[model samples]
Target: PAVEVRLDKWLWAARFYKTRALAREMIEGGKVHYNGQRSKPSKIVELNATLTLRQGNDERTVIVKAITEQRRPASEAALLYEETAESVEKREKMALARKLNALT
Candidate 1:
């Protein structure tokens, strides 16, 4: 209905996790968000601004730098999102603390 594509679509298009297959699951499990709220698994968005989530404990911050209608090439799509430095101030203390506890 808009230039905004599905949230799950943006996930895979930007290479955070994979495809909508798992991306959708991530949405259902609170692995991601938009404007600080949980949206539908396939919610629509331009993904041009604001972001907050993805992958594992380390890759916590993700900013939407740009957007495309179709998922582009790997290198090109990578630029669509920016990897933020680890956050210690906003909801990441557990990640910072627990990452060292696991063998992984």
Candidate 2:
């Protein structure tokens, strides 16, 4: 489970998307990057690897902290990866800007 996990499956298992198909779509739809380039959904994952996933307008660049195959609850799934500082900060900024725009 730690090393034999597929990219798309891991995404779903980690609660990144609603279903495995959506994870595969985003992966192949060019919204996800493994390391620094696009990769197949079947690609295997390794510990401490990096992934950049674009969900809506929030680009979350996260490092693979652990691996799992079982789809756990939100709390357990949330620990699968850790986001970069810039990614976290950028999202907050984007939300703030979006709210300001919505006020118009």
Candidate 3:
């Protein structure tokens, strides 16, 4: 069986949301998607699972690389998921757009 952890906790531990409660709120509010479908905070997330999460004005798509229950250092948390190159580029572009918007 693929190693797994609760979605909310994993999101928090992975440093997506600042807290588990916030992760739960976002998941319930449909800000997060698991494998292309809406998911509950209690949903189990496995290694290599695809996740799409909306943050601010950008959305990120990443593949789970590891699982953990405790919040860790930013460096460590970053290793928990692998962000798709396209997602990174899109996020950067979105940020640039937002910056331009603010300037104009």
Candidate 4:
């Protein structure tokens, strides 16, 4: 089972939104879904479950690996979970494409 965290806090800690309020707004706006269903801002997110989120053109699929109530430093955020290899590759490619596109 995955670790548990409040939806609002998790969204903020995971870098989804800038603040807990924004997370709640996004969650209520149907931008965040857990296990294929909409969730409340207070919902407890469990580890090992998929969380799908979409905002404008940005889409993210994340699997919860661990949870922490205390926010960790930026450097330690990388240790929170194992981002899917495909997701990493996709982001890398997107980054390169954006760079290339910007240079044009």
Candidate 5:
């Protein structure tokens, strides 16, 4: 069975946020979602569960790949979740749009 962890802790461990406090702040402020709805920092996250989170102007949708409460190296932390292709494409397009807008 897959392990479970607190949403905020998992977000930190997954390198989505630098600190648990930041993760909690984002989560509580409606910048993070479990599946498709807002969730509390204390909510449990497990394998295959979906998460959508925002950081600055980029928003990502990812599926949980593993669980951990302790933060790890960036390389290791990245293995804890997998970003969706649609999310990646959307982020890239948004970035390009922003870049174009900046020049005009």
Candidate 6:
């Protein structure tokens, strides 16, 4: 079971979308899906819950393993729940892609 966190609030605290407004936009835009369905910003989430999030030209399917309500510094954010293997792989790939693009 995962911890309960409102989708908008979690995204804000996680720094996923930078601001809550962006987070809510993500939800309303159908970029945030949970439990195989489109989720609203008001829905609560927990660890191990599947979330399909799309940003720009990329979409990521990640599982929430842990989270906190309050925003923190980058170091503290690192202590947040571990990303699933899917997330890890996607993130790594995205990082490399960005690095390559920056070099070109």
Q: Which has the greatest TM-score?
A: 2
Task: List the candidates' TM-scores in order.
Answer: 0.67, 0.91, 0.88, 0.73, 0.90, 0.70
Q: What is the lDDT of residue 91 in candidate 1?
A: 40
Tens-place lDDT digits, model 1, residues 1-104: 45657788788878777677888888888778776777776676655555677557543566677766567787988888766555434447665567768756
Superior candidate under TM-score, 2 versus 3: 2
Q: How many collisions per candidate? A: 1, 0, 0, 1, 0, 1
By TM-score, rank the candidates, best first.
Answer: 2, 5, 3, 4, 6, 1
Q: Score candidate 3 by TM-score against the native.
A: 0.88
1-104: candidate 2 lDDT, tens digit per residue: 43599999999998988899999999999899999999889999888889999887679999999888989999989999999999999999989999999999
Q: Give the worst 10-residue stretch by lDDT in candidate 1.
A: 82-91
Clashes of 6: 1
Task: Name the TM-score of candidate 5.
Answer: 0.90
Ranking by lDDT, best first? 3, 2, 5, 4, 6, 1
Per-residue lDDT value at 96 in model 4: 89
Candidate lDDT (C-alpha), each: 0.70, 0.91, 0.91, 0.77, 0.90, 0.77
Model 6 lDDT per residue over 56-103, tens place: 666667677667788888767545445567767987898899999999
Better of 3 and 4 by TM-score: 3
Better of 2 and 5 by TM-score: 2
Instruction: Name the better of 3 and 6 by TM-score.
Output: 3
Judge candidate 6 against the unseen true structure and give its global Cα lDDT, from 0 to 1: 0.77
Regions of model 3 farther than 4 Å from truth: 1-3, 100-104
Question: Which ranges of candidate 2 are over 4 A from the true structure?
Answer: none
